[PDB]
C-alpha cells in the first residue's frame, strides 16, 4: 500500500496473507469469507506471462496477522489449502477479466478477536454502495512505493472512480467485472495498492446495517499511485453466482 497508514489491531480481521512455503515470501493478499473459505485474485495463483502457476501445496494462508514478517504467536493462525478454484473464464491473456479465485482450507479456522469473516454483497448491497465517489478500504502488506516493505498491515481508503475516467486512464480494455478506485490528480490525496497487495479485499461498511462487505479484490494496476492512473478491482458481486456455485458444490 502506497501512501496509506498502519492498521489498528483487529481492524481487518478478515485479512489473509498468502505465503509462499518456500522460499518464504509474501505472495498476495486474500480475505476470509467463512471458516473454511478464502477469497483472492486469480492472478495471485495463475499468470503464465510471469511463469506463475501455484498449486495448493505451494502456499499457506496466514490469518489474524498484523506484523508482516513476524510469527505472531497465539494470535495468527496458519492454514493449509485443500483446494484452489480459479474462475474458469479468468482472462489472463488480456486484461485479467474475472480475476477471482477461492481457496478451501483443510480445516476450519477458529474465529477470535483477530480472525473474523467479511460479508459478501448481495445485489442490493452492490447497487447501494458501488457508486462513484463512495470510498472503500484496501489493506495489505505490499510495497510502500512503486520503486520499502511495511512492518505492519497497511490501510488506505480510496474512492470509487467514474467508469469513463477509469476507461480513459488506460489502454487496457475494461469490463463490467472490474471497477477502479483512487484519487484523481486534482484531488490532492493519494493512495493505491501496490506489489504484494494483489488479491486483498476492497471493503465498504454498509451504513444500513453496520456490516463490512467485500466489494472488490485488488486486481491489476499500471504502476502504483501514479497520477492519473487508478487501481482496478474485481467486482465481487458480479462474480457472486460463481462464488456461490463453488461453495455450494464443494463446501462442507
Amino acid at each position: 500500500i502506497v501512501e496509506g497508514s498502519d492498521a489498528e489491531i483487529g481492524m481487518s480481521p478478515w485479512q489473509v496473507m498468502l505465503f509462499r512455503k518456500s522460499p518464504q515470501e509474501l505472495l498476495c493478499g486474500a480475505s476470509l469469507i467463512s471458516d473454511r473459505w478464502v477469497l483472492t485474485a486469480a492472478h495471485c495463483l495463475l499468470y503464465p506471462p510471469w511463469d506463475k502457476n501455484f498449486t495448493e501445496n505451494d502456499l499457506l494462508v496466514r490469518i489474524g496477522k498484523h506484523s508482516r514478517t513476524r510469527y505472531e504467536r497465539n494470535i495468527e493462525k496458519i492454514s493449509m489449502l485443500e483446494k484452489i478454484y480459479i474462475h474458469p473464464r479468468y482472462n489472463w491473456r488480456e486484461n485479467l477479466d474475472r480475476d477471482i479465485a477461492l481457496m478451501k482450507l483443510k480445516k476450519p479456522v477458529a474465529f477470535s478477536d483477530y480472525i473474523h469473516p467479511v460479508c459478501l454483497p448481495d445485489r442490493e448491497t452492490a447497487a447501494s454502495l458501488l457508486q462513484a465517489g463512495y470510498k472503500g478500504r484496501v489493506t495489505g502488506w505490499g510495497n510502500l512505493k512503486e520503486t520499502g516493505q511495511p512492518s505492519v498491515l497497511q490501510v488506505v481508503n480510496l474512492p470509487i472512480v467514474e467508469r469513463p475516467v477509469c476507461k480513459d486512464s488506460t489502454r487496457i480494455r475494461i469490463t463490467d467485472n472490474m471497477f477502479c478506485a483512487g484519487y484523481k490528480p486534482d484531488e490532492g490525496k493519494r493512495g493505491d495498492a501496490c506489489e504484494g497487495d494483489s488479491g486483498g479485499p476492497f471493503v465498504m461498511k454498509s451504513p444500513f446495517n453496520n456490516r463490512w462487505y467485500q466489494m472488490g479484490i485488488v486486481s491489476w494496476g499500471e504502476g502504483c499511485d501514479r497520477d492519473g492512473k487508478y487501481g482496478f478491482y474485481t467486482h465481487v458481486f458480479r462474480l457472486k453466482k460463481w462464488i456461490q456455485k463453488v461453495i455450494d458444490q464443494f463446501g462442507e
Binding site: 497508514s5 473474523h116 465517489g133 470510498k135 472503500g136 490501510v155 461498511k205 454498509s206 453496520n210 463490512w212
Partner: peptide
C-alpha cells in the same frame, strides 16, 4: 450471520480511526 462485524470494533461499539471517512462518502 455475524459476518462483517469486527470483535474489536462493531461488537464493542468502537470505531476505527478512519471509518468515518467512509461513512461521509456514502451520500445515498
Amino acid at each position: 450471520a455475524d459476518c462483517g462485524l469486527r470483535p474489536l470494533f462493531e461488537k464493542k461499539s468502537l470505531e476505527d480511526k478512519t471509518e468515518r471517512e467512509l461513512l461521509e462518502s456514502y451520500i445515498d
